[PDB]
Amino acid sequence: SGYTPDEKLRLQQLRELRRRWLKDQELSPREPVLPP
Amino acid sequence: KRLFIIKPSGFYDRRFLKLMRFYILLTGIPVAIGITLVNVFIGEAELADIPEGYVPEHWEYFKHPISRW
Ligand SMILES: CCCCCCCCCCCCCCCCCC(=O)OC[C@H](COP(=O)([O-])OCC(O)COP(=O)([O-])OC[C@@H](COC(=O)CCCCCCCCCCCCCCCCC)OC(=O)CCCCCCCCCCCCCCCCC)OC(=O)CCCCCCCCCCCCCCCCC
């Protein structure tokens, strides 16, 4: 029943990485740098 | 909050469409203007009977000026 310690630790590491990746998909206030 | 949208590169399709439109228009806008000018200022011939003793040229059996040319 439940996660094994390896399963839970791997899920936590993958969760941290995925959350940073999703945070990095955000746009800075100037990202659409439109040329004239 | 604004997010980045992952897409395939649309630059090349857009450039191809722009080039095809440019070349088609480059040749076909002069053709349209010329056809309009010919139609307005040199209309079609009107049908007439062949006068006595007159033998027409082979292109005188058509009425549109472009077809005659
Ligand atoms: C874009 C790039 C992307 C890729 C796209 C792919 C493109 C591929 C292209 C490949 C190459 C294309 C080549 C094709 C060759 C074809 C050329 C050709 O043979 O043309 C023949 C033909 C010309 O006829 P013609 O045999 O030469 O002339 C015989 C007559 O003697 C002439 O009659 P006329 O002398 O008495 O008329 C006067 C004269 C001039 O007309 C007038 O002056 C009178 C007009 C009437 C106006 C009246 C009122 C307006 C003014 C009112 C206000 C002012 C006065 C009052 C002011 C005071 C105000 C108070 O009329 C004309 O000359 C017509 C103009 C001809 C233009 C034809 C264009 C061909 C271009 C060839 C290359 C195409 C390249 C594409 C780019 C071209 C540019 C977009 O051209 C046309 O047919 C034009 C269309 C006309 C149709 C009218 C619309 C009726 C439609 C009804 C049916 C639809 C029902 C609904 C459908 C279903 C929906 C639900």
TrEMBL record, chain A:
Q: Which domain of life is it from?
A: Eukaryota
Localization terms from the record: Mitochondrion inner membrane
**Per the similarity annotation, which family is this?**
Belongs to the complex I NDUFB6 subunit family.
The free-text function statement in the UniProt record for this protein reads: Accessory subunit of the mitochondrial membrane respiratory chain NADH dehydrogenase (Complex I), that is believed not to be involved in catalysis. Complex I functions in the transfer of electrons from NADH to the respiratory chain. The immediate electron acceptor for the enzyme is believed to be ubiquinone.
| Record text on subunit structure and interactions | Complex I is composed of 45 different subunits.
Q: What is this protein called?
A: NADH dehydrogenase [ubiquinone] 1 beta subcomplex subunit 6
Species name for this entry?
Answer: Sus scrofa
Parent-protein start and end of this portion: 2 to 37 of 128
From TrEMBL, chain B:
Q: Which residues cross the membrane?
A: 22-42
Compartments, record wording? Mitochondrion inner membrane
Q: Which domain of life is it from?
A: Eukaryota
Q: What does this protein do?
A: Accessory subunit of the mitochondrial membrane respiratory chain NADH dehydrogenase (Complex I), that is believed not to be involved in catalysis. Complex I functions in the transfer of electrons from NADH to the respiratory chain. The immediate electron acceptor for the enzyme is believed to be ubiquinone.
Instruction: Give the family this protein belongs to, as stated in its UniProt record.
Output: Belongs to the complex I NDUFB5 subunit family.
* Subunit organization: Complex I is composed of 45 different subunits.
This chain belongs to the protein called NADH dehydrogenase [ubiquinone] 1 beta subcomplex subunit 5, mitochondrial
Organism listed in the record: Sus scrofa
Q: Which residues of the full protein are shown?
A: 52 to 120 of 189
